[PDB]
Amino acid sequence: TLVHVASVEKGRSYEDFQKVYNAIALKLREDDEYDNYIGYGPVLVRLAWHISGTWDKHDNTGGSYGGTYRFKKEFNDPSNAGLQNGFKFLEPIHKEFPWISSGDLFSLGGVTAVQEMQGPKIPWRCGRVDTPEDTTPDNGRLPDADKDAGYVRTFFQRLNMNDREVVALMGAGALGKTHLKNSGYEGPWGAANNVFTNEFYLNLLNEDWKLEKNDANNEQWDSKSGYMMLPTDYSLIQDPKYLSIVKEYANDQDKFFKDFSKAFEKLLENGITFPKDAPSPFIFKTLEEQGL
Ligand code: HEM
């Protein structure tokens, strides 16, 4: 019940993908003004998560492999509202490197953004293959934000993620912000929202949060510091098992970076079979490491 074998883009190797990395990274640098100077890093790692998070372990439908976000049904998923911005960013890159598959580009965009925003290295594998429009999953596989801990735990079981993987993933460097017109929630999780940090965990623990209603008539937790947490975020300190992992990552930056790197790669790779003869995962160099 549904197999997807990774097939390396013909004749490509590490250096080819580093070149795509760099063009993405260079474009991140250049289009700095987007979203009141947040830049496109956060929306790129949200795009990578949403294209991967449609996966279902039961029948291997959804997932990053087929690059199906390029079809209207998924592009138009209300859950993906705002991600068009990320797709538009990547269009010039796809045009310069037409040989890369859509799944590989969406997922490599997420890796690139995380690394350029000073996050951990994320090992990445190529070989996703575009699949037809009829393989696009239905809307409704991404998680709601108005729910509690039990919802979150059950939701992520479908993505084969456990408690520790779920808390590392959500804490997601503390990046970008909620926008009322996209999601019915408004504001950032922290102060350094285009730098990958463990500040989400710190803020959850140390801020003084009040449950308020936003202009869209949705509840969210708000802080005097100007920060916000989704009901689902806040549930990570309401559930005692989540809570001890929140404290752990708030008190160990390196541990969080390593756990996140593992789970993000895992997330991006769910549903994909890699041949024994596949190339090993690539670790890309940042622009800064290349002196670029
Ligand atoms: C229970 C799971 C989660 C829920 C309910 C969810 C929900 C949300 C919501 C409502 C937004 C705001 C969208 C908008 O208004 O622009 C948001 C932002 C985003 N999400 Fe999540 N999220 C979850 C998991 C994740 C995880 C696992 C990642 C990736 C590792 C992630 C990365 C992001 C990013 C980076 C943003 C900011 C995008 C922007 O600034 O443009 N989310 N998400």
Swiss-Prot record:
The modification Phosphotyrosine is found at residue 151. It comes from Saccharomyces cerevisiae (strain ATCC 204508 / S288c). GO terms for biological process: cellular response to oxidative stress; hydrogen peroxide catabolic process; response to reactive oxygen species. It comes from the Eukaryota. Present with 6730 molecules/cell in log phase SD medium. The gene is CCP1. Heme b binds at residue 173. Belongs to the peroxidase family. Cytochrome c peroxidase subfamily. GO terms for molecular function: cytochrome-c peroxidase activity; heme binding; metal ion binding; peroxidase activity. Its EC number is 1.11.1.5. Forms a one-to-one complex with cytochrome c. The keyword Acetylation does not apply. One of its GO terms (cellular component) is mitochondrial matrix. Destroys radicals which are normally produced within the cells and which are toxic to biological systems. This is Cytochrome c peroxidase, mitochondrial.
